[PDB]
Design a protein around this ligand. Structure first.
Ligand SMILES: C[As](C)(=O)[O-]
Lengths: 96, 96
C-alpha cells in the first residue's frame, strides 16, 4: 500500500520505532492521537525524532509550511534570491 | 525611503519604463489600477515585462505564490529534496 503510512499509531510508538532507524530523514505519517483527522509527520534527525502537523488550508491542499511576508519590503528582499515566478527563475534586481 | 516603490503609475507606464532597463529582474511596485487598494509587481524579463499581484492572506501577510499539495503523496516526495523544517535542513528518507 504505502511504506510510510502506518495509519493510526501512538506518537510514543513512532518515537520508539524511528529512534532505531539508522538515517536522518527516517519518517512516517501517522494518525494524530490529539487532534483527530489530521495527520502528523514523525521523522528522525540526530538524537531526536521530530513531528510536524500536516496542515490543510481552505482549499484542502496539504502542506507543512509556506513562506509569507510581514511587509512588502520583506517580500521584495526575499525575492531577490528566490524567484517571483513559479515557472521561471526570475529574481528581483534594482532599477537604474 | 523606498527606491522600488513607484506609487500609483499606470500599468502601461510601468511596462514602458521597465522595458527600457537592461537587466532581467528590474522591477517596481505600484498601486494596482485594476484593483484600487492592492499592490502589483512589475518585473522586466526577456523581451517582455511580467506583472504580479501582491496577494494578502487571512492574516494579512504578503506573498506572491506558495507551495502546497493536492495529495499527501505529493507532499512527501517533494520533501525528499526540500527540508520539512523551516529552520533545519531535514529531508525525508524512507524507512528500513
Ligand atoms: C500531534 As501528534 C503527536 O498527536 O500527532
Amino acid at each position: 500500500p504505502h511504506p510510510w503510512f502506518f495509519g493510526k499509531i501512538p506518537r510514543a510508538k513512532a518515537e520508539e520505532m524511528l529512534s532505531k532507524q539508522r538515517h536522518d530523514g527516517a519518517f512516517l505519517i501517522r494518525e494524530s492521537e490529539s487532534a483527530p483527522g489530521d495527520f502528523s509527520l514523525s521523522v528522525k534527525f540526530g538524537n531526536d525524532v521530530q513531528h510536524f502537523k500536516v496542515l490543510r488550508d481552505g482549499a484542502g491542499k496539504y502542506f507543512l509550511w509556506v513562506v509569507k511576508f510581514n511587509s512588502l519590503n520583506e517580500l521584495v528582499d526575499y525575492h531577490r534570491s528566490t524567484s517571483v515566478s513559479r515557472n521561471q527563475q526570475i529574481f528581483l534586481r534594482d532599477i537604474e
